[model samples]
Target: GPKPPIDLVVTETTATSVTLTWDSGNSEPVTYYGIQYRAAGTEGPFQEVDGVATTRYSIGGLSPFSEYAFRVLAVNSIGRGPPSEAVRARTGEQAPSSPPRRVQARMLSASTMLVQWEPPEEPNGLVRGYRVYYTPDSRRPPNAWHKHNTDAGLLTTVGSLLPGITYSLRVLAFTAVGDGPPSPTIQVKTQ
Candidate 1:
């Protein structure tokens, strides 16, 4: 029978795809290639593709910033062989799909307040940092806002606020590409 694919390796990965290549399967001449894969770390009833004519192939329909495992099976005139040793790959990331979660703002002083939030529910990219936006929640024509940044964290303080004022605050996550969607506004009143 034909042997399983050998030395399977990931070649490239994009936000929605992964490419793989393998050394030739030994023993009897092989038939068409069959590839199987599943979400990484799962007890996979794997997804499959057949009728591939080459050892190099690309798999599409993947999610960004997520991991999957892959293997190849070789078949011949005699029969199919064991599945190859599996390999893992993670797709590249896009900006986060959703805004930060559970945002809150609390005044710590007359000029500073703590803004906190949870990571995005669908962060397509790594959450490298967070930004907090604040502005006086009044009837101003141009509700201009200021921002504070924190690296790889969920909390930061916004300052330079005037006393006895209520400000609107929102949080945002960011990755390599750019910022994610903004969180819902919360209020902070300084004494």
Candidate 2:
């Protein structure tokens, strides 16, 4: 068997990335290395990171504030070797990266409306509901609209609106740190 990478250790982590470095094991040379990882405490299969040409590598675009288990394997002319002992590490959180997707707004009554949306693609931290921004006159920007909060979840409803009125609305997802991004405006009239 080809000698595996040895003494693998996590060097650093950001909101969506990780860095690692390792010793080359007892062997003198290795053509390249393979890195495999999975979320810690899960029995799922490891995700293989390709084209790792050296003992130190950095991988990106991962979930924030989550822990992961990692390993590295050496590949010489002999093909590949068994993975190194697993090491666990975690990435820090950020104020998310992208807006929530597929936002929907619909009238529940003549004076009430409900809104729902999937979480942001890069909710770099946990989502804490949203600030619902709306204006009945026109689709004005955030600074000019009245705002209200709908508590945490995928869906929430607002009340106390005029019957037969149309409202332009959007929602912004947020964390304790800050707001992530704003959804596209959706126009709907009260039933």
Candidate 3:
């Protein structure tokens, strides 16, 4: 029998793109299929992105941070099947122009805490790392802070802090462009 319906799946969403895959099958006669798509927002008309084809395809060239809608159709010597159910998906947010500005840490225990921060006003193109600084004693001057430079793979790192000691932290986002501004100072004590 003709394929019951096209099962369309959307995957790999980036700032400006989305990848879609689907099952296009026809029975014994061995025929081709036709796929159709459209953006959900605008009125007026639907634009075709695919022509007569095989099975899978990746659709791209979309606006960043936008929501899109899609549907699929299957065609054969027999005829075209009804359009597949409409599927809605969104693309990623636009890439920021700046690196991270700062990071903040809150002590959860003697060993861990939750951390977060903001991006910098300007971003460094190749900043493959970040510098996180901390101090365990209340007596240490700010300049004496110990630094743990997190390399390319780190977004955040947790440390085993010493109990009964106060700790302060600051973060710097670095890229090929340069190091962005250092994050605001954050302080906490372990009990």
Candidate 4:
């Protein structure tokens, strides 16, 4: 009789893939293995993935920033074996693929401006946060940039600015994995 696989572990994970590795239990040698998975915390007819000959398999086309439960079963000359202990893993969040679009800035006061942009064209994962980068318009060496953080909103206030200084600004979208490229730079002068 075939034996259940053991020590099932998720070895690596990305936004769209997870690699599972496991050990064959004591018994006959395995010809192949069956993998099944489903979203975590729901009644599911687990989805069957193609069998693999090796002790490791990589599952792809998964949703980023989501949790999944997986199980593996060994197959031998006789038949399919018992399933290993189910394991849970969450796919990592990915940075948005495109920067925010249609950025616009407006002078709100003598020392403040309101910066706004549309959401990213492809928010690859949940928009966890955002960063705004700004610096005084200077052709000098090492223009020190200032930064501000905000939630998944489209607008933010860039304030405490020098009234007469021109500034260059851009914004970046970020998920758990990383930040996307900055939006096209915009220039504005404080009121």
In terms of lDDT, which candidate is strongest?
A: 4
lDDT tens per residue, model 1, 1-191 = 67889999999999999999997678656777889999875774999998777889999998888889999988777777789999999999988878899998787777878778889998888889988777785344323677677897877877678998878777889888788988877777789
Model 2: runs farther than 4 Å from truth? 38-53, 63-67, 94-122, 150-164, 181-191
Over 4 Å off in model 4, which ranges? 41-43, 97-128, 131-155, 158-172, 176-191
* Tens-place lDDT digits, model 3, residues 47-123: 56645475566677766556778766676666767766767778765433454555656766668755666655544
Tens-digit lDDT track of model 2 for 21-134: 998784567788889988766777899986678779998877787898889988888688889999988888778678878889888777888888888887767787677888
Candidate 4 accuracy as TM-score? 0.58
The lDDT for every candidate, in the order shown, is: 0.84, 0.82, 0.63, 0.84
Candidate 4 at residue 97, lDDT?
Answer: 82
Q: Write the per-residue lDDT of candidate 4 for residues 1-191, one digit (tens) a residue.
A: 57888999999998889999999885667989999898775685987775689899999998776789989988888888888899999988788888988888878889888999888877777888788888885453323678888998989997788977789888889877788888988899875
Residue 42, model 1: lDDT of 71
Q: How accurate is candidate 4 locally (lDDT)?
A: 0.84
lDDT of 2: 0.82
Q: Using Cα atoms with residue i matched to residue i, what is each candidate's TM-score against the true structure?
A: 0.82, 0.68, 0.44, 0.58
- Supply candidate 3's per-residue lDDT for 54: 59
Report clash pairs, candidate 2.
96-124
Of candidate 3, the 10-residue stretch with the lowest lDDT total is: 93-102
If ranked by TM-score, best first, what sequence of candidates would result?
A: 1, 2, 4, 3
